[PDB]
Enzyme design. Structure first.
Site, PDB file in Angstrom:
ATOM      1  N   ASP A   8       0.844  -1.225  -0.168  1.00 32.08           N
ATOM      2  CA  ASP A   8      -0.098   0.009   0.125  1.00 32.08           C
ATOM      3  C   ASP A   8       0.909   1.279  -0.070  1.00 32.08           C
ATOM      4  O   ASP A   8       1.528   1.591   1.052  1.00 32.08           O
ATOM      5  CB  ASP A   8      -0.828   0.100   1.069  1.00 32.08           C
ATOM      6  CG  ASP A   8      -1.884   1.174   1.200  1.00 32.08           C
ATOM      7  OD1 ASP A   8      -2.074   1.929   0.344  1.00 32.08           O
ATOM      8  OD2 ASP A   8      -2.662   1.484   2.303  1.00 32.08           O
ATOM      9  N   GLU A 755      -1.227  -1.331  -4.222  1.00 32.39           N
ATOM     10  CA  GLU A 755      -2.177  -0.375  -4.220  1.00 32.39           C
ATOM     11  C   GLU A 755      -1.451   1.242  -3.876  1.00 32.39           C
ATOM     12  O   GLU A 755      -0.554   1.426  -3.056  1.00 32.39           O
ATOM     13  CB  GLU A 755      -3.292  -0.391  -3.107  1.00 32.39           C
ATOM     14  CG  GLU A 755      -4.366   0.419  -3.245  1.00 32.39           C
ATOM     15  CD  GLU A 755      -4.825   0.747  -1.550  1.00 32.39           C
ATOM     16  OE1 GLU A 755      -5.371   1.731  -1.293  1.00 32.39           O
ATOM     17  OE2 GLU A 755      -4.858  -0.250  -0.967  1.00 32.39           O
ATOM     18  N   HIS A 823     -23.547  16.348  -7.967  1.00 30.26           N
ATOM     19  CA  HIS A 823     -22.383  15.975  -8.840  1.00 30.26           C
ATOM     20  C   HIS A 823     -22.967  15.595 -10.259  1.00 30.26           C
ATOM     21  O   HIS A 823     -23.941  15.234 -10.396  1.00 30.26           O
ATOM     22  CB  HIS A 823     -21.823  14.864  -8.528  1.00 30.26           C
ATOM     23  CG  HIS A 823     -21.216  14.918  -7.091  1.00 30.26           C
ATOM     24  ND1 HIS A 823     -19.926  15.103  -6.719  1.00 30.26           N
ATOM     25  CD2 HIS A 823     -21.961  14.691  -5.805  1.00 30.26           C
ATOM     26  CE1 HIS A 823     -19.761  15.009  -5.344  1.00 30.26           C
ATOM     27  NE2 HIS A 823     -20.857  14.983  -4.658  1.00 30.26           N
ATOM     28  N   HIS A1253     -19.271  15.741  30.096  1.00 29.18           N
ATOM     29  CA  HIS A1253     -20.208  15.385  28.841  1.00 29.18           C
ATOM     30  C   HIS A1253     -20.899  13.889  28.860  1.00 29.18           C
ATOM     31  O   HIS A1253     -21.187  13.862  27.732  1.00 29.18           O
ATOM     32  CB  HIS A1253     -19.522  15.821  27.555  1.00 29.18           C
ATOM     33  CG  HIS A1253     -19.311  17.346  27.346  1.00 29.18           C
ATOM     34  ND1 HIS A1253     -18.302  17.913  28.017  1.00 29.18           N
ATOM     35  CD2 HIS A1253     -20.061  18.068  26.698  1.00 29.18           C
ATOM     36  CE1 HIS A1253     -18.260  19.381  27.554  1.00 29.18           C
ATOM     37  NE2 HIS A1253     -19.430  19.521  26.846  1.00 29.18           N
TER      38      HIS A1253
END
Ligand code: K
Ligand code: K
Ligand code: K
Ligand code: K
Ligand code: K
Ligand code: K
Ligand code: K
Ligand code: K
Ligand code: K
Ligand code: K
Ligand code: MG
Ligand code: MG
Ligand code: MG
Length: 1322
Positions: A8, A755, A823, A1253
RNA sequence: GGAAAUUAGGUGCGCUUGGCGUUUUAGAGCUAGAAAUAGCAAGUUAAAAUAAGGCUAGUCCGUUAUCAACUUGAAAAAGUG
DNA sequence: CAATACCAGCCAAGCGCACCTAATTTCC
DNA sequence: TGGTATTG
């Protein structure tokens, strides 16, 4: 054992993984070298190499140019001082010495501290008489009195040191005295041509309006408002725009089919005007001549704001005007603010920190910052009317050395320099003899086609000399061979014919080359009529008839012309159909018609005997750009044409080169026929073979002669195209493969799956030219800063002129959040999310059905609007083509088939080279038929294949957790790549290097992995547990066994993430010169410039650090104390340190250095401390986090779905049921942080910010958990936010603790290690 | 997989140039003060440096690419688990 | 010593060659 | 982000 490699490649990483036939990643034990008690270590064969971005050479190039220009500016001053040397000695034998040492303090000066006259009373009197250099410059131009030879030099030196630009060719003689008489004369020539409708000149202060300090656009609107019954787009309105330097379009004024845009400053104007005058008539010639005359007097109105009647120094006089109005308005502003705002007088005129006049003169406040700060003050007060007016024109309290002085041409400085030399010439004899010499110093400029004036020690130089002697501005023509140099400047860069590599390609506009392109396209046209049984070629006699009748008559030949002007007349066919060319021919005899306009001798261009001479003319016009050198080379043919034709032929020029040589197309011959390639294109019987057919046909000799005529690895990669950033990953990829092969016992892998991964200043200029071309008012109605264009919808808003473009309405900037960004081509079909495929409509449904390209009714309604945005460069032609695709039938079954093939098969040329390189290294043997044996199959995949695979089987990816995803992607590439090829061996052609049916196949190709597949047809398909190749029966995928292998691989906590250690290079330090301070951190800018007196640089860049073990003198007694410390070697110090490390370190203060224990520690050197806590060297005084937080897989996909939220409702229950994972992930972070991060305050601040939170939604809480990994990520500590709690980075400035830790040396894969226990040293 | 042409857009490499900025110095600050300070005046310009520097001494070169460690290599690259 | 605060050269012009992308025609 | 200076 057999194995495959997954790769990769990215701009900053290279993922790698080794897999077996069972899709398992092998674990091995590797030797551990060094002095530790560890002899080996277990390692999985999966990891990723990380590296800083490879840099482009641009910044290095810009700096190399700046260095050359500073060297030559100094040499200009040196040339002038050498001329002044003898005569200046008789006036002041130390004048030039005081100029040289002016930077020094009085302590270090060898002469008196006043540079000009060497004493204080003369020095003060000079600044009283000439407050600025422009006061002296103007005095020396206008006065007739003999002047001090020192003051003469200072004026000439100031004009040569800052000489102005070279953008205007020819001579300039400023003369603004006749602006009034030139304007009326223009309206006089307009009134004799348009005696029907004339214009009245009186009452128009044309000088004031056209010489005003406003924009050329603003000055035009004022003049037309003064002229009743006129318009800015009327003929006289567009004429005025021409004289002011604008580019108006005369197309609408004369009912013209094409544009008639003219600009007096462009060199194409002389021919553009002739093109227009032939269109509209020759009686309009004086009209554009008078526009040229009026343009010369107002050309430099912005630079010269003083009428040229008083002085011959309009530039200097304009600077004195700046100074006097600065003085007057400063006295007024003081007395004003003294009477009305006495409380603030201290802030404006004394505080350098504030952006007042004090900060404007002595602080760091710019002219703009000064105007913004003070403008509110002037408004509040009374009597500041004219100053507010002077402010808004950017003409208030102006300095004479300003950012906007780039408008000044060098001819203006030369005019004042010539005038000074003309005055004092009479009094100083040596200024007479060297008047031209001094003028040459200012005007001379090294031509770009010559390059550096080197002598065999520059890798950038190509210059050739006529005589071996020193080059000066005065002997440049006689010493430099400009002809040979201008030729080498091109031939060193031009391609060779790939077919005949020893031959240079023809010029793109060569007559021979265009005959080739025309006959190569013509010879494949087929025509059919009613009578004939089959469509036939055009014979040799027909093609010459078409070339002579059509191609040599019109620029472009249309099939319409072909139908109606050849077959309709010469063959009398009233209806013929043409095959092989649509709408019009691509090729054209452009150069033929170009020369035909210049020489008019059509017989001469058709005379075949002039083939060689016509080729030499086009070659000269292409090879050279200096019109003087072109004339000299065309002089050998001057006898053939009249003098006016030579004047036209010399100006005409071309650029660009072809792809084929002259010898290939019209040189080499077939043995049997004796015809060259061009001869076959003219006549080949009834075969009518073209270029590709001719050089591949075994019947003739071309194929063999081309084959007859037919580099390190690092070289090969650097010579590729593409970004130097992605090239860095390519070389590392190869080096990673080589090591993996050696790891696997030098056995080559079965497969290698590779890749490859997929501003504002340029955007603002595009918008500016876009609206200005269309003449809209949206920039006037809505002004934006260049930085604000980084908004997608707002950037689209300006590209669309603030108007919806699916439907005919306007858009509002305030409602940007309510519009849509559809698009053009559906994002499902094409993975194009650039500006080329985006649009800003109101509603996505106003496009029509999203099945296809926008509706045909939409295109028919918006066709004209899209062609306007094209002609304003606001949309590309491709974007226009895609929008208008619906009228051309839209998408088809074939069109939709090609898109999904592009989604799976990588077509990028850069990725093909990586596959070619790897295939070349792996497969090197040949068989009985000398065909390459393909041991290793190199497969290439695109990201969508593994992306879908991750999202289909819930192997989710979260980039922020750690760097493991780089390696995981490489593993999944090897699995998917090998399984796809073993399952469908027929795909090796499409995936290994070296309509509706195709659409359905590729769209369902990955289905064999699943068990229950839902199809778009509604068909639910079931597949067995095990998958196999139908022909061989070999097992490919075991859905009850092989999926479990993937999670076992992805959950492995030990993967080899390696940060590539790199010696730092580049600039020595930061560039800013700091004022003098009493610190010893400052760096001298010159050898003798002690920064305590002169200041210098800060923050030097450490190239690498060195472990120094030695002794230092301690206390006043100078007793030697043993030490072990980390010394950062700077980039500047590196060469001297490596030349002699002992003397360098001994000069630093170290004695008896253990030379054999010096350890070179580059950036990112890895250290392990306690409990596996790791640090990376950022420098000698800075550390980076060295650990990776291996989060369990169950938390990763839970963090994915909770942050992201068919069966979307099913996955939602997983999120809700496993809501307890949050306190587990937080515990994972805290446990990891307390072990390796050691940011106690930052940790409990996150813990406190977390517990605050807890009542937030789970989606909102899951997003900020991802932010927390910034606290634990590898590398430099960085500031992140948790909800609205911003937690600053905790940095590691103490590098003491690494000196007793374990130094880890890693190979490129990190599998081979050398570990050094540094605590054993000292 | 590849070639040429056509249209449009983009990146790379190289060369030649313009204008600022910044730094130190020069452009006599005045008056009252022991002095710290206070009150006023003044301000716009120039020189020089602009990677330290190098030898090959050119109106040349000096910020890209490439680099774990050990044993050999000028270097590339090889040799070692 | 460790925490905390703040800092970082910019703008512009011209010329040339090479290469990549995506769409079309004709071919190997 | 790594350097400098102040802070503490
Ligand atoms: K002295
Ligand atoms: K009007
Ligand atoms: K300043
Ligand atoms: K300033
Ligand atoms: K200045
Ligand atoms: K066409
Ligand atoms: K040319
Ligand atoms: K770097
Ligand atoms: K580098
Ligand atoms: K390494
Ligand atoms: Mg400059
Ligand atoms: Mg220098
Ligand atoms: Mg300056």
């Amino acid at each position: 054992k057999k194995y495959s490699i997954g790769l990769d490649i990215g701009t900053n990483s290279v993922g790698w993984a080794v897999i077996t036939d069972e899709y398992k990643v092998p674990s091995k034990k590797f030797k551990v070298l060094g002095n530790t008690d560890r002899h080996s270590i277990k390692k999985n064969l999966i990891g990723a190499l990380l590296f800083d971005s490879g840099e482009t050479a641009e910044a290095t190039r810009l700096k190399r140019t700046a260095r050359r220009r500073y060297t030559r500016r100094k040499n200009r001053i040196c040339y002038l001082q050498e001329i002044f040397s003898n005569e200046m000695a008789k006036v002041d034998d130390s004048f030039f010495h005081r100029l040289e040492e002016s930077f020094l303090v009085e302590e270090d000066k060898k002469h008196e501290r006043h540079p000009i006259f060497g004493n204080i009373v003369d020095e003060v009197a000079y600044h009283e008489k000439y407050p600025t250099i422009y006061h002296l410059r103007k005095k020396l131009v206008d006065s007739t009195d003999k002047a001090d030879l020192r003051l003469i030099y200072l004026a000439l030196a100031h004009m040569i040191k800052f000489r102005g630009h070279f953008l205007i060719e020819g001579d300039l003689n400023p003369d603004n005295s006749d602006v009034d008489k030139l304007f009326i004369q223009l309206v006089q020539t307009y009134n004799q041509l348009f005696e029907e409708n004339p214009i009245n000149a009186s009452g128009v202060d044309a000088k004031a309006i056209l010489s005003a300090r406003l924009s050329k656009s603003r000055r035009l609107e004022n003049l037309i408002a003064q002229l009743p019954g006129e318009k800015k787009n009327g003929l006289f309105g567009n004429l005025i725009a021409l004289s002011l330097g604008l580019t108006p379009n005369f197309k609408s004024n004369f009912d013209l089919a094409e544009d008639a845009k003219l600009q007096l400053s462009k060199d194409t104007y002389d021919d553009d005007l002739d093109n227009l005058l032939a269109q509209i008539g020759d009686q309009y010639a004086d009209l554009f001549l008078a526009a040229k005359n009026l343009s010369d007097a107002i050309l430099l109105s912005d630079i010269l704001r003083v009428n040229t009647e008083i002085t011959k120094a309009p530039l200097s006089a304009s600077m004195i005007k700046r100074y006097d109005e600065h003085h007057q308005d400063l006295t007024l502003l003081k007395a004003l603010v003294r009477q009305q705002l006495p409380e603030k007088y201290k802030e404006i005129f004394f505080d350098q920190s504030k952006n007042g006049y004090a900060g404007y003169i002595d602080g760091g406040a710019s002219q703009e910052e000064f105007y913004k700060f003070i403008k509110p003050i002037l408004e509040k007060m009374d009597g500041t009317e004219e100053l507010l007016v002077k402010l808004n024109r950017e003409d208030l309290l102006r300095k004479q050395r300003t950012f906007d002085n780039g408008s000044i041409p060098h001819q203006i400085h030369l005019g004042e320099l010539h005038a000074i030399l003309r005055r004092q010439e009479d009094f100083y004899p040596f200024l007479k003899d060297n008047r031209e010499k001094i003028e040459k110093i200012l005007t001379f400029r090294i031509p770009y086609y010559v390059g550096p004036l080197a002598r065999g020690n520059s890798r950038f130089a190509w210059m050739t000399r006529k005589s071996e002697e020193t080059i000066t501005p005065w002997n440049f023509e006689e010493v430099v061979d400009k002809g040979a140099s201008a030729q080498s400047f091109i031939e060193r860069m031009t391609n060779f014919d790939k077919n005949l590599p020893n031959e240079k390609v023809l010029p793109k506009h060569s007559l021979l080359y265009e005959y080739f392109t025309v006959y190569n396209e013509l010879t494949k046209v087929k025509y059919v009529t009613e009578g004939m049984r089959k469509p036939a070629f055009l014979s040799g006699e027909q093609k010459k008839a078409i070339v002579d009748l059509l191609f040599k008559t019109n620029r472009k030949v249309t099939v319409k012309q072909l139908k109606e002007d050849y077959f309709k007349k010469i063959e009398c066919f009233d209806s013929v159909e043409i095959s092989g060319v649509e709408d019009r021919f691509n090729a054209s005899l452009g150069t033929y018609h170009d020369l035909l306009k210049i020489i008019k001798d059509k017989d001469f261009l058709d005379n075949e005997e002039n083939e060689d001479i016509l080729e030499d003319i086009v070659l000269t016009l292409t090879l050279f750009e200096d019109r003087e050198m072109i004339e000299e080379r065309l002089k050998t043919y001057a006898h053939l044409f009249d003098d006016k034709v030579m004047k036209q032929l010399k100006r005409r020029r071309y650029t660009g080169w072809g792809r084929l040589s002259r010898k290939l197309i019209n040189g080499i011959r077939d043995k049997q026929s004796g015809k060259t390639i061009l001869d076959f294109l003219k006549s080949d019987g009834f075969a009518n073979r073209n270029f590709m057919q001719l050089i591949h046909d075994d019947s003739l000799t071309f194929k063999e002669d081309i084959q007859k005529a037919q580099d390190s690895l690092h070289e090969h990669i650097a010579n590729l195209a593409g970004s130097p950033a992605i090239k860095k990953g390519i070389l590392q990829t190869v080096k990673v493969v080589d090591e993996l092969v050696k790891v696997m016992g030098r056995h080559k892998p079965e497969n290698i799956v590779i890749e490859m991964a997929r501003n504002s200043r340029e955007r603002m200029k595009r918008i500016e030219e876009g609206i200005k071309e269309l003449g809209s008012q949206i920039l006037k109605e809505h002004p934006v800063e260049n930085t604000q264009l980084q908004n997608e919808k707002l950037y689209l808003y300006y590209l669309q002129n603030g108007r919806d473009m699916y439907v005919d309405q306007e858009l509002d900037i305030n409602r940007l959040s309510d519009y849509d960004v559809d698009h053009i081509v559906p994002q499902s079909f094409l993975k194009d999310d650039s500006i080329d495929n985006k649009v800003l409509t109101r509603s996505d449904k106003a496009r029509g059905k999203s099945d296809n390209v926008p509706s045909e009714e939409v295109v028919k309604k918006m066709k004209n609007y899209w062609r306007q945005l094209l002609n304003a460069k606001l949309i590309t032609q491709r974007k226009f083509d895609n929008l208008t695709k619906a009228e051309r039938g839209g998408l088809s079954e074939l069109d939709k088939a090609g898109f999904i093939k592009r989604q799976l098969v990588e077509t990028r040329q850069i990725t093909k080279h990586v596959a070619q390189i790897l295939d070349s290294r792996m497969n090197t043997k040949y068989d009985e038929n000398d065909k390459l044996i393909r041991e290793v199959k190199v497969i290439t995949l695109k990201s969508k294949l593994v992306s879908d695979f991750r999202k289909d089987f819930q192997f989710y990816k979260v980039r922020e957790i750690n760097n493991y995803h780089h390696a995981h992607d490489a593993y999944l590439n090897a699995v998917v790549g090998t399984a796809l090829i073993k399952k469908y061996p027929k795909l090796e052609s499409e995936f290994v290097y070296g309509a509706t049916a195709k659409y359905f196949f590729y769209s369902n190709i990955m289905n064999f992995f699943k068990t229950e597949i839902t199809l778009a047809n509604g068909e639910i398909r079931k597949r067995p547990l095990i998958e196999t190749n139908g022909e061989t029966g070999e097992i490919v995928w075991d859905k009850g066994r092989d999926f479990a292998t993937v999670r076992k691989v992805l959950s492995m906590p030990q993967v080899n993430i390696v940060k590539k250690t790199e010696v730092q290079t580049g600039g020595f330090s930061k560039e800013s010169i700091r004022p003098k301070r009493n610190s010893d951190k400052l760096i001298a800018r010159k050898k003798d410039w002690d920064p305590k007196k002169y200041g210098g640089f800060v923050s030097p860049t450490v190239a690498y650090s060195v472990l120094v073990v030695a002794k230092v003198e301690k206390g006043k007694s100078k007793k030697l104390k043993s030490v072990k410390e980390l010394l950062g070697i700077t980039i500047m110090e590196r060469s001297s340190f490596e030349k002699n490390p002992i003397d360098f370190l001994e000069a630093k203060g170290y004695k008896e250095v253990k030379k054999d224990l010096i350890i070179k520690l580059p950036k990112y050197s890895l250290f392990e401390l306690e409990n596996g806590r790791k640090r990376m060297l950022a420098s000698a005084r800075f550390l980076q986090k060295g650990n990776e937080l291996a989060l369990p897989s169950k938390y990763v996909n839970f963090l994915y779905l909770a942050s992201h939220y068919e069966d979307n409702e099913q996955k939602q229950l997983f999120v809700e049921q496993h809501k307890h994972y949050l306190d587990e992930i937080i515990e994972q972070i805290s446990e990891f942080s307390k072990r390796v991060i050691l940011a106690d305050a930052n940790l409990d601040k996150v813990l406190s910010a977390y517990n605050k939170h807890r009542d937030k939604p789970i989606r909102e809480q899951a997003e900020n958990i991802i932010h927390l990994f910034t606290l634990t990520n590898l590398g430099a500590p960085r500031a992140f936010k948790y909800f609205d709690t911003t937690i600053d980075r905790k940095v590691y400035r103490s590098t003491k603790e690494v000196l007793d830790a374990t130094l880890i040396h890693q190979s490129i894969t990190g599998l081979y290690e050398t570990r050094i226990d540094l605590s054993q040293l000292g």
